PDB file of C-alpha atoms in Angstrom:
ATOM      1  CA  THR A   1     -39.585 -17.556  93.595  1.00  0.00           C
ATOM      2  CA  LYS A   2     -36.972 -15.836  91.111  1.00  0.00           C
ATOM      3  CA  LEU A   3     -38.561 -16.492  88.181  1.00  0.00           C
ATOM      4  CA  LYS A   4     -36.327 -15.124  84.950  1.00  0.00           C
ATOM      5  CA  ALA A   5     -37.498 -14.917  80.993  1.00  0.00           C
ATOM      6  CA  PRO A   6     -36.523 -17.544  78.486  1.00  0.00           C
ATOM      7  CA  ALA A   7     -33.191 -17.588  76.354  1.00  0.00           C
ATOM      8  CA  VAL A   8     -35.292 -16.757  73.470  1.00  0.00           C
ATOM      9  CA  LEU A   9     -38.204 -14.354  74.238  1.00  0.00           C
ATOM     10  CA  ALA A  10     -39.618 -12.171  71.404  1.00  0.00           C
ATOM     11  CA  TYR A  11     -42.999 -10.513  70.728  1.00  0.00           C
ATOM     12  CA  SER A  12     -44.412  -9.419  67.286  1.00  0.00           C
ATOM     13  CA  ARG A  13     -45.032  -5.913  66.358  1.00  0.00           C
ATOM     14  CA  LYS A  14     -48.396  -4.808  67.132  1.00  0.00           C
ATOM     15  CA  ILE A  15     -49.064  -1.574  65.713  1.00  0.00           C
ATOM     16  CA  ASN A  16     -48.042  -1.864  61.729  1.00  0.00           C
ATOM     17  CA  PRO A  17     -48.150   1.305  59.711  1.00  0.00           C
ATOM     18  CA  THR A  18     -47.569   1.269  55.885  1.00  0.00           C
ATOM     19  CA  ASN A  19     -45.009   3.244  54.601  1.00  0.00           C
ATOM     20  CA  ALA A  20     -46.496   6.940  53.861  1.00  0.00           C
ATOM     21  CA  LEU A  21     -46.990   8.321  50.363  1.00  0.00           C
ATOM     22  CA  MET A  22     -46.466  12.116  49.554  1.00  0.00           C
ATOM     23  CA  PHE A  23     -48.611  13.830  47.033  1.00  0.00           C
ATOM     24  CA  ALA A  24     -49.114  17.518  45.819  1.00  0.00           C
ATOM     25  CA  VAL A  25     -52.947  18.945  45.893  1.00  0.00           C
ATOM     26  CA  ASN A  26     -54.651  22.275  45.788  1.00  0.00           C
ATOM     27  CA  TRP A  27     -56.068  22.977  49.591  1.00  0.00           C
ATOM     28  CA  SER A  28     -59.697  23.307  48.130  1.00  0.00           C
ATOM     29  CA  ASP A  29     -59.057  20.515  45.274  1.00  0.00           C
ATOM     30  CA  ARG A  30     -57.822  17.534  47.469  1.00  0.00           C
ATOM     31  CA  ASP A  31     -59.100  14.967  44.584  1.00  0.00           C
ATOM     32  CA  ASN A  32     -56.738  16.017  41.776  1.00  0.00           C
ATOM     33  CA  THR A  33     -53.480  14.515  43.338  1.00  0.00           C
ATOM     34  CA  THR A  34     -50.196  14.308  41.481  1.00  0.00           C
ATOM     35  CA  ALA A  35     -47.371  12.572  42.800  1.00  0.00           C
ATOM     36  CA  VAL A  36     -44.313  14.121  44.383  1.00  0.00           C
ATOM     37  CA  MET A  37     -40.973  12.565  42.939  1.00  0.00           C
ATOM     38  CA  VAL A  38     -37.628  12.162  44.059  1.00  0.00           C
ATOM     39  CA  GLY A  39     -35.241  14.170  42.180  1.00  0.00           C
ATOM     40  CA  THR A  40     -31.218  14.167  42.081  1.00  0.00           C
ATOM     41  CA  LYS A  41     -28.822  17.483  41.816  1.00  0.00           C
ATOM     42  CA  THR A  42     -25.440  18.404  42.334  1.00  0.00           C
ATOM     43  CA  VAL A  43     -24.670  20.892  45.023  1.00  0.00           C
ATOM     44  CA  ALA A  44     -21.225  23.117  45.008  1.00  0.00           C
ATOM     45  CA  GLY A  45     -19.648  23.526  48.582  1.00  0.00           C
ATOM     46  CA  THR A  46     -19.618  21.683  51.814  1.00  0.00           C
ATOM     47  CA  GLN A  47     -20.858  23.884  55.058  1.00  0.00           C
ATOM     48  CA  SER A  48     -17.473  24.794  56.647  1.00  0.00           C
ATOM     49  CA  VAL A  49     -17.433  23.361  60.133  1.00  0.00           C
ATOM     50  CA  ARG A  50     -15.429  24.479  63.468  1.00  0.00           C
ATOM     51  CA  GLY A  51     -11.542  24.383  62.488  1.00  0.00           C
ATOM     52  CA  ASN A  52     -10.160  23.215  58.797  1.00  0.00           C
ATOM     53  CA  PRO A  53     -10.768  26.460  56.948  1.00  0.00           C
ATOM     54  CA  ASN A  54      -9.175  24.665  53.691  1.00  0.00           C
ATOM     55  CA  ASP A  55      -9.947  21.219  53.575  1.00  0.00           C
ATOM     56  CA  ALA A  56     -10.052  18.689  50.292  1.00  0.00           C
ATOM     57  CA  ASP A  57     -13.548  18.109  49.902  1.00  0.00           C
ATOM     58  CA  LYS A  58     -14.955  21.711  50.592  1.00  0.00           C
ATOM     59  CA  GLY A  59     -14.597  22.785  47.188  1.00  0.00           C
ATOM     60  CA  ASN A  60     -16.022  19.357  45.730  1.00  0.00           C
ATOM     61  CA  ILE A  61     -19.472  18.769  44.268  1.00  0.00           C
ATOM     62  CA  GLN A  62     -21.936  16.615  46.074  1.00  0.00           C
ATOM     63  CA  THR A  63     -25.241  14.841  44.500  1.00  0.00           C
ATOM     64  CA  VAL A  64     -28.069  14.828  46.816  1.00  0.00           C
ATOM     65  CA  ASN A  65     -31.691  13.782  46.525  1.00  0.00           C
ATOM     66  CA  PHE A  66     -34.691  16.565  46.950  1.00  0.00           C
ATOM     67  CA  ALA A  67     -38.212  16.680  46.534  1.00  0.00           C
ATOM     68  CA  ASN A  68     -40.590  19.632  46.142  1.00  0.00           C
ATOM     69  CA  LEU A  69     -43.845  20.439  45.574  1.00  0.00           C
ATOM     70  CA  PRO A  70     -45.098  21.430  42.084  1.00  0.00           C
ATOM     71  CA  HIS A  71     -45.680  24.987  41.476  1.00  0.00           C
ATOM     72  CA  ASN A  72     -49.300  24.473  40.736  1.00  0.00           C
ATOM     73  CA  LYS A  73     -49.899  22.931  43.944  1.00  0.00           C
ATOM     74  CA  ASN A  74     -50.226  24.369  47.528  1.00  0.00           C
ATOM     75  CA  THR A  75     -50.757  21.386  49.883  1.00  0.00           C
ATOM     76  CA  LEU A  76     -48.817  18.401  50.444  1.00  0.00           C
ATOM     77  CA  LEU A  77     -51.011  15.201  50.988  1.00  0.00           C
ATOM     78  CA  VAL A  78     -49.234  12.525  53.197  1.00  0.00           C
ATOM     79  CA  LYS A  79     -51.115   9.016  53.112  1.00  0.00           C
ATOM     80  CA  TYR A  80     -50.857   5.841  55.119  1.00  0.00           C
ATOM     81  CA  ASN A  81     -52.656   3.362  56.986  1.00  0.00           C
ATOM     82  CA  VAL A  82     -52.108   1.970  60.510  1.00  0.00           C
ATOM     83  CA  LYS A  83     -53.318  -1.802  61.292  1.00  0.00           C
ATOM     84  CA  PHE A  84     -53.453  -2.277  65.223  1.00  0.00           C
ATOM     85  CA  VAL A  85     -53.326  -6.007  65.764  1.00  0.00           C
ATOM     86  CA  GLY A  86     -54.548  -8.119  69.136  1.00  0.00           C
ATOM     87  CA  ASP A  87     -53.303 -10.564  71.200  1.00  0.00           C
ATOM     88  CA  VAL A  88     -50.461  -8.374  72.618  1.00  0.00           C
ATOM     89  CA  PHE A  89     -49.667 -10.625  75.428  1.00  0.00           C
ATOM     90  CA  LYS A  90     -49.131 -13.725  72.947  1.00  0.00           C
ATOM     91  CA  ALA A  91     -45.281 -14.284  72.646  1.00  0.00           C
ATOM     92  CA  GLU A  92     -44.242 -15.000  69.359  1.00  0.00           C
ATOM     93  CA  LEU A  93     -41.254 -17.457  70.342  1.00  0.00           C
ATOM     94  CA  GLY A  94     -40.891 -16.927  74.208  1.00  0.00           C
ATOM     95  CA  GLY A  95     -42.022 -20.003  76.471  1.00  0.00           C
ATOM     96  CA  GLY A  96     -45.262 -19.663  78.074  1.00  0.00           C
ATOM     97  CA  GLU A  97     -45.061 -20.076  81.554  1.00  0.00           C
ATOM     98  CA  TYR A  98     -42.819 -16.664  82.094  1.00  0.00           C
ATOM     99  CA  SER A  99     -45.023 -15.106  79.542  1.00  0.00           C
ATOM    100  CA  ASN A 100     -48.554 -16.644  80.810  1.00  0.00           C
ATOM    101  CA  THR A 101     -47.594 -14.296  84.503  1.00  0.00           C
ATOM    102  CA  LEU A 102     -46.513 -11.858  82.836  1.00  0.00           C
ATOM    103  CA  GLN A 103     -49.911 -11.831  80.742  1.00  0.00           C
ATOM    104  CA  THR A 104     -52.287 -12.053  84.332  1.00  0.00           C
ATOM    105  CA  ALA A 105     -50.107  -9.586  85.711  1.00  0.00           C
ATOM    106  CA  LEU A 106     -50.144  -6.684  83.054  1.00  0.00           C
ATOM    107  CA  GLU A 107     -54.312  -7.590  82.632  1.00  0.00           C
ATOM    108  CA  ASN A 108     -55.232  -4.526  84.838  1.00  0.00           C
ATOM    109  CA  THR A 109     -53.616  -2.167  82.158  1.00  0.00           C
ATOM    110  CA  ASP A 110     -55.136   1.183  80.910  1.00  0.00           C
ATOM    111  CA  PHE A 111     -55.565  -0.082  77.642  1.00  0.00           C
ATOM    112  CA  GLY A 112     -57.804   2.978  77.350  1.00  0.00           C
ATOM    113  CA  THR A 113     -54.972   5.585  77.878  1.00  0.00           C
ATOM    114  CA  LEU A 114     -52.716   3.836  75.856  1.00  0.00           C
ATOM    115  CA  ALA A 115     -54.868   3.824  72.686  1.00  0.00           C
ATOM    116  CA  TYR A 116     -55.793   6.869  73.191  1.00  0.00           C
ATOM    117  CA  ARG A 117     -52.346   8.604  72.887  1.00  0.00           C
ATOM    118  CA  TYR A 118     -51.311   6.122  70.078  1.00  0.00           C
ATOM    119  CA  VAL A 119     -54.238   7.726  68.472  1.00  0.00           C
ATOM    120  CA  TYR A 120     -53.579  11.063  69.367  1.00  0.00           C
ATOM    121  CA  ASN A 121     -50.008  11.035  67.954  1.00  0.00           C
ATOM    122  CA  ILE A 122     -51.478   9.819  64.640  1.00  0.00           C
ATOM    123  CA  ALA A 123     -54.391  12.801  64.673  1.00  0.00           C
ATOM    124  CA  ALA A 124     -52.054  15.658  65.627  1.00  0.00           C
ATOM    125  CA  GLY A 125     -49.825  14.838  62.917  1.00  0.00           C
ATOM    126  CA  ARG A 126     -46.505  13.838  64.898  1.00  0.00           C
ATOM    127  CA  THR A 127     -45.357  11.866  62.363  1.00  0.00           C
ATOM    128  CA  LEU A 128     -45.040  15.326  59.836  1.00  0.00           C
ATOM    129  CA  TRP A 129     -41.815  16.585  61.904  1.00  0.00           C
ATOM    130  CA  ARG A 130     -40.045  18.979  59.556  1.00  0.00           C
ATOM    131  CA  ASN A 131     -43.029  19.169  57.061  1.00  0.00           C
ATOM    132  CA  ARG A 132     -45.193  21.371  59.585  1.00  0.00           C
ATOM    133  CA  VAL A 133     -42.763  24.122  59.798  1.00  0.00           C
ATOM    134  CA  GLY A 134     -44.252  27.317  57.657  1.00  0.00           C
ATOM    135  CA  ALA A 135     -47.236  25.517  57.021  1.00  0.00           C
ATOM    136  CA  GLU A 136     -50.604  27.989  56.838  1.00  0.00           C
ATOM    137  CA  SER A 137     -52.608  25.094  57.990  1.00  0.00           C
ATOM    138  CA  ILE A 138     -52.676  21.305  59.099  1.00  0.00           C
ATOM    139  CA  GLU A 139     -55.577  18.867  58.717  1.00  0.00           C
ATOM    140  CA  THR A 140     -55.781  15.294  59.677  1.00  0.00           C
ATOM    141  CA  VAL A 141     -58.621  13.039  58.376  1.00  0.00           C
ATOM    142  CA  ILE A 142     -58.757   9.410  59.647  1.00  0.00           C
ATOM    143  CA  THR A 143     -61.112   6.984  58.407  1.00  0.00           C
ATOM    144  CA  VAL A 144     -62.119   3.525  60.253  1.00  0.00           C
ATOM    145  CA  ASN A 145     -65.217   1.388  59.418  1.00  0.00           C
ATOM    146  CA  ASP A 146     -66.919   3.911  57.286  1.00  0.00           C
ATOM    147  CA  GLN A 147     -66.698   6.563  59.729  1.00  0.00           C
ATOM    148  CA  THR A 148     -64.725   9.957  59.147  1.00  0.00           C
ATOM    149  CA  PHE A 149     -62.859  12.272  61.226  1.00  0.00           C
ATOM    150  CA  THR A 150     -61.318  15.190  61.012  1.00  0.00           C
ATOM    151  CA  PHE A 151     -58.703  17.474  62.901  1.00  0.00           C
ATOM    152  CA  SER A 152     -57.369  20.624  62.703  1.00  0.00           C
ATOM    153  CA  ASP A 153     -55.209  22.261  65.829  1.00  0.00           C
ATOM    154  CA  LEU A 154     -53.938  19.741  68.352  1.00  0.00           C
ATOM    155  CA  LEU A 155     -51.208  20.509  70.823  1.00  0.00           C
ATOM    156  CA  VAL A 156     -48.961  17.942  69.732  1.00  0.00           C
ATOM    157  CA  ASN A 157     -46.909  17.350  73.030  1.00  0.00           C
ATOM    158  CA  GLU A 158     -49.967  18.007  75.324  1.00  0.00           C
ATOM    159  CA  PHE A 159     -52.322  14.815  75.129  1.00  0.00           C
ATOM    160  CA  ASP A 160     -55.199  17.092  75.062  1.00  0.00           C
ATOM    161  CA  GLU A 161     -58.552  16.326  75.098  1.00  0.00           C
ATOM    162  CA  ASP A 162     -61.143  15.640  72.622  1.00  0.00           C
ATOM    163  CA  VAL A 163     -64.388  13.283  71.576  1.00  0.00           C
ATOM    164  CA  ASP A 164     -63.329  12.157  68.245  1.00  0.00           C
ATOM    165  CA  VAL A 165     -59.624  10.663  69.446  1.00  0.00           C
ATOM    166  CA  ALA A 166     -61.553   8.564  72.346  1.00  0.00           C
ATOM    167  CA  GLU A 167     -64.169   7.580  70.055  1.00  0.00           C
ATOM    168  CA  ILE A 168     -61.305   6.151  67.772  1.00  0.00           C
ATOM    169  CA  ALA A 169     -59.385   5.083  71.047  1.00  0.00           C
ATOM    170  CA  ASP A 170     -62.056   2.929  71.819  1.00  0.00           C
ATOM    171  CA  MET A 171     -62.188   0.972  68.890  1.00  0.00           C
ATOM    172  CA  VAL A 172     -58.223   0.494  69.169  1.00  0.00           C
ATOM    173  CA  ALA A 173     -58.321  -0.010  72.715  1.00  0.00           C
ATOM    174  CA  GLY A 174     -60.746  -2.795  72.084  1.00  0.00           C
ATOM    175  CA  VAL A 175     -58.329  -4.640  69.568  1.00  0.00           C
ATOM    176  CA  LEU A 176     -55.200  -4.097  71.336  1.00  0.00           C
ATOM    177  CA  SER A 177     -57.353  -5.497  74.795  1.00  0.00           C
ATOM    178  CA  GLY A 178     -58.581  -8.419  73.115  1.00  0.00           C
ATOM    179  CA  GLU A 179     -58.719 -10.042  69.473  1.00  0.00           C
ATOM    180  CA  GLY A 180     -58.746  -8.767  65.894  1.00  0.00           C
ATOM    181  CA  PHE A 181     -57.376  -6.072  64.168  1.00  0.00           C
ATOM    182  CA  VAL A 182     -58.792  -2.513  62.865  1.00  0.00           C
ATOM    183  CA  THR A 183     -57.116  -0.370  60.245  1.00  0.00           C
ATOM    184  CA  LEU A 184     -57.235   3.310  60.370  1.00  0.00           C
ATOM    185  CA  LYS A 185     -56.651   5.224  56.857  1.00  0.00           C
ATOM    186  CA  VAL A 186     -54.856   8.348  57.435  1.00  0.00           C
ATOM    187  CA  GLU A 187     -54.071  11.569  55.306  1.00  0.00           C
ATOM    188  CA  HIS A 188     -52.375  14.682  56.234  1.00  0.00           C
ATOM    189  CA  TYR A 189     -52.767  17.853  54.121  1.00  0.00           C
ATOM    190  CA  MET A 190     -50.014  20.184  54.998  1.00  0.00           C
ATOM    191  CA  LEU A 191     -51.117  23.969  53.348  1.00  0.00           C
ATOM    192  CA  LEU A 192     -47.425  25.053  52.592  1.00  0.00           C
ATOM    193  CA  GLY A 193     -47.534  26.913  49.219  1.00  0.00           C
ATOM    194  CA  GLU A 194     -46.599  26.364  45.668  1.00  0.00           C
ATOM    195  CA  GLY A 195     -43.049  24.629  45.216  1.00  0.00           C
ATOM    196  CA  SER A 196     -42.593  24.056  48.690  1.00  0.00           C
ATOM    197  CA  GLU A 197     -39.556  21.726  49.426  1.00  0.00           C
ATOM    198  CA  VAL A 198     -40.875  18.770  51.096  1.00  0.00           C
ATOM    199  CA  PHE A 199     -38.914  16.086  53.760  1.00  0.00           C
ATOM    200  CA  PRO A 200     -39.514  12.256  52.923  1.00  0.00           C
ATOM    201  CA  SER A 201     -37.580   9.918  55.027  1.00  0.00           C
ATOM    202  CA  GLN A 202     -33.484  10.305  54.994  1.00  0.00           C
ATOM    203  CA  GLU A 203     -31.608   7.168  54.041  1.00  0.00           C
ATOM    204  CA  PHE A 204     -27.798   7.104  54.990  1.00  0.00           C
ATOM    205  CA  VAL A 205     -25.692   4.804  53.107  1.00  0.00           C
ATOM    206  CA  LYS A 206     -22.168   8.139  46.220  1.00  0.00           C
ATOM    207  CA  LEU A 207     -25.168  10.198  47.124  1.00  0.00           C
ATOM    208  CA  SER A 208     -24.342  12.450  50.142  1.00  0.00           C
ATOM    209  CA  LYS A 209     -27.722  12.803  51.213  1.00  0.00           C
ATOM    210  CA  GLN A 210     -30.683  10.164  49.967  1.00  0.00           C
ATOM    211  CA  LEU A 211     -34.044  10.028  50.420  1.00  0.00           C
ATOM    212  CA  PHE A 212     -36.691   7.353  50.652  1.00  0.00           C
ATOM    213  CA  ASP A 213     -38.802   6.398  47.700  1.00  0.00           C
ATOM    214  CA  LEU A 214     -41.185   4.265  46.449  1.00  0.00           C
ATOM    215  CA  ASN A 215     -41.052   3.894  42.763  1.00  0.00           C
ATOM    216  CA  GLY A 216     -39.398   7.181  42.463  1.00  0.00           C
ATOM    217  CA  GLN A 217     -42.270   8.853  44.593  1.00  0.00           C
ATOM    218  CA  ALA A 218     -41.265  10.363  47.729  1.00  0.00           C
ATOM    219  CA  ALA A 219     -42.112   8.555  50.729  1.00  0.00           C
ATOM    220  CA  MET A 220     -41.527   8.122  54.972  1.00  0.00           C
ATOM    221  CA  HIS A 221     -40.292   4.972  56.256  1.00  0.00           C
ATOM    222  CA  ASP A 222     -43.387   2.888  57.997  1.00  0.00           C
ATOM    223  CA  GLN A 223     -41.213   2.660  61.037  1.00  0.00           C
ATOM    224  CA  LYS A 224     -40.502   6.343  61.360  1.00  0.00           C
ATOM    225  CA  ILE A 225     -43.964   6.576  61.320  1.00  0.00           C
ATOM    226  CA  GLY A 226     -44.316   3.588  64.107  1.00  0.00           C
ATOM    227  CA  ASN A 227     -41.940   5.738  66.262  1.00  0.00           C
ATOM    228  CA  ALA A 228     -44.254   8.867  65.951  1.00  0.00           C
ATOM    229  CA  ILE A 229     -47.298   6.959  66.963  1.00  0.00           C
ATOM    230  CA  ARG A 230     -45.194   5.167  70.200  1.00  0.00           C
ATOM    231  CA  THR A 231     -44.265   8.552  71.460  1.00  0.00           C
ATOM    232  CA  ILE A 232     -46.273   8.554  74.771  1.00  0.00           C
ATOM    233  CA  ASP A 233     -44.061   7.690  77.153  1.00  0.00           C
ATOM    234  CA  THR A 234     -44.437  10.567  79.777  1.00  0.00           C
ATOM    235  CA  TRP A 235     -43.843   8.545  82.816  1.00  0.00           C
ATOM    236  CA  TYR A 236     -39.810   8.346  83.203  1.00  0.00           C
ATOM    237  CA  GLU A 237     -37.701  10.184  85.512  1.00  0.00           C
ATOM    238  CA  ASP A 238     -38.310  13.682  85.468  1.00  0.00           C
ATOM    239  CA  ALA A 239     -40.990  13.499  82.212  1.00  0.00           C
ATOM    240  CA  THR A 240     -41.258  16.935  80.490  1.00  0.00           C
ATOM    241  CA  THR A 241     -42.200  15.821  76.867  1.00  0.00           C
ATOM    242  CA  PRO A 242     -43.119  12.422  75.462  1.00  0.00           C
ATOM    243  CA  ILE A 243     -40.609  10.047  74.314  1.00  0.00           C
ATOM    244  CA  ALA A 244     -41.079   7.109  71.809  1.00  0.00           C
ATOM    245  CA  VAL A 245     -41.522   3.748  73.963  1.00  0.00           C
ATOM    246  CA  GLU A 246     -37.719   1.925  74.131  1.00  0.00           C
ATOM    247  CA  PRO A 247     -36.790  -0.687  76.517  1.00  0.00           C
ATOM    248  CA  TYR A 248     -34.255   1.966  78.175  1.00  0.00           C
ATOM    249  CA  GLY A 249     -36.227   5.091  77.051  1.00  0.00           C
ATOM    250  CA  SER A 250     -33.255   6.056  75.188  1.00  0.00           C
ATOM    251  CA  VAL A 251     -33.544   8.290  71.857  1.00  0.00           C
ATOM    252  CA  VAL A 252     -31.739   8.483  68.861  1.00  0.00           C
ATOM    253  CA  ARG A 253     -31.550  11.923  67.822  1.00  0.00           C
ATOM    254  CA  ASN A 254     -29.893  13.858  71.042  1.00  0.00           C
ATOM    255  CA  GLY A 255     -28.623  10.334  72.286  1.00  0.00           C
ATOM    256  CA  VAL A 256     -30.039   9.975  75.925  1.00  0.00           C
ATOM    257  CA  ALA A 257     -31.609   7.166  77.817  1.00  0.00           C
ATOM    258  CA  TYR A 258     -34.044   8.422  80.243  1.00  0.00           C
ATOM    259  CA  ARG A 259     -34.907   4.841  81.680  1.00  0.00           C
ATOM    260  CA  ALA A 260     -31.394   3.365  82.476  1.00  0.00           C
ATOM    261  CA  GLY A 261     -29.659   2.781  85.639  1.00  0.00           C
ATOM    262  CA  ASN A 262     -32.878   3.825  87.985  1.00  0.00           C
ATOM    263  CA  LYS A 263     -34.856   0.449  88.158  1.00  0.00           C
ATOM    264  CA  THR A 264     -37.329   2.060  85.814  1.00  0.00           C
ATOM    265  CA  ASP A 265     -36.014  -0.069  82.545  1.00  0.00           C
ATOM    266  CA  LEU A 266     -38.631  -2.352  80.489  1.00  0.00           C
ATOM    267  CA  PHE A 267     -36.616  -5.544  81.884  1.00  0.00           C
ATOM    268  CA  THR A 268     -36.653  -4.666  85.377  1.00  0.00           C
ATOM    269  CA  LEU A 269     -40.060  -3.930  85.436  1.00  0.00           C
ATOM    270  CA  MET A 270     -40.726  -7.108  83.811  1.00  0.00           C
ATOM    271  CA  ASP A 271     -38.790  -9.319  85.910  1.00  0.00           C
ATOM    272  CA  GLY A 272     -41.031  -7.714  88.829  1.00  0.00           C
ATOM    273  CA  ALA A 273     -44.208  -8.426  87.506  1.00  0.00           C
ATOM    274  CA  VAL A 274     -43.509 -11.587  86.708  1.00  0.00           C
ATOM    275  CA  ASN A 275     -42.106 -12.190  90.525  1.00  0.00           C
ATOM    276  CA  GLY A 276     -45.271 -10.452  91.840  1.00  0.00           C
ATOM    277  CA  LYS A 277     -43.681  -6.945  92.878  1.00  0.00           C
ATOM    278  CA  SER A 278     -46.469  -4.025  93.246  1.00  0.00           C
ATOM    279  CA  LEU A 279     -46.784  -1.970  89.752  1.00  0.00           C
ATOM    280  CA  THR A 280     -47.899   1.281  89.056  1.00  0.00           C
ATOM    281  CA  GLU A 281     -50.806   2.542  86.326  1.00  0.00           C
ATOM    282  CA  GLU A 282     -47.943   4.101  84.471  1.00  0.00           C
ATOM    283  CA  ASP A 283     -45.249   1.116  84.457  1.00  0.00           C
ATOM    284  CA  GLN A 284     -48.248  -1.467  83.528  1.00  0.00           C
ATOM    285  CA  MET A 285     -48.903   0.839  80.660  1.00  0.00           C
ATOM    286  CA  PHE A 286     -44.933   1.020  79.492  1.00  0.00           C
ATOM    287  CA  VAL A 287     -44.588  -2.705  79.575  1.00  0.00           C
ATOM    288  CA  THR A 288     -47.650  -3.548  77.680  1.00  0.00           C
ATOM    289  CA  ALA A 289     -46.158  -0.755  75.210  1.00  0.00           C
ATOM    290  CA  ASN A 290     -43.204  -2.507  74.795  1.00  0.00           C
ATOM    291  CA  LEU A 291     -44.880  -5.432  74.562  1.00  0.00           C
ATOM    292  CA  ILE A 292     -46.791  -3.870  71.541  1.00  0.00           C
ATOM    293  CA  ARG A 293     -43.911  -2.659  70.098  1.00  0.00           C
ATOM    294  CA  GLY A 294     -42.092  -6.273  69.887  1.00  0.00           C
ATOM    295  CA  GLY A 295     -38.868  -7.109  70.183  1.00  0.00           C
ATOM    296  CA  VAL A 296     -36.120  -9.714  71.718  1.00  0.00           C
ATOM    297  CA  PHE A 297     -36.538  -9.730  75.476  1.00  0.00           C
ATOM    298  CA  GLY A 298     -34.013 -12.399  76.362  1.00  0.00           C
ATOM    299  CA  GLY A 299     -30.585 -14.168  76.391  1.00  0.00           C
TER     300      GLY A 299
END
């Protein structure tokens, strides 16, 4: 056979979270919300680093953004929505022949497990990250087609079993393995304590540390929430903790590619799927998840 991908093979992103807004509430008065605002301040000193006791910028002021809960609210509220969109096998810019046999080759993908892991990542509150430190309690509320689910203590790095995540994941899988769309409205409550610092998304560009803001209100990037949602890959070589689904399985925090140079990257399995190579339940899920994430797969 020896069929290769078209020059311009592109797939649209199918999991679309909104940006997340950050509010302050009291744990037992979650209705009376107030917006958490990003402020700007000046800091004296720069943490000394190895060597260089006396530098130029050590005794230099730095301008940084910050965000905190007010002193009369003890709980951080994080609100966002996530729209799952179907037709995950219909390419945006790819040809058709190469993408249609890939579609029929990945038609046995365990969509139930993919949806369960996505929804679990949402319900376990992975995207909360630094905002989980020093929290007395974390609660997640998910509404979907007039159905409210509450989650309290789920292990983040173990996709443990529970029935509400399954009920949500069945609708999500019906959309992902079919047509249409479905929206989950998500709220996270972190009992942090009055005045506690909260951690919006960081931006890297004047300011020595910038925070994401929507009209001045502390916010989290949609793409960081998406990265938290797709942290489902436990099928790479020598797998321990889940990693975000990425063509080469590479992470940005510690900078390692867990799926490079071992015949387990996205493109190798892609070509094999097209050319009739036997595919495991795991790599079918991995290829379909990369199609769900979207990207440019050619050139």
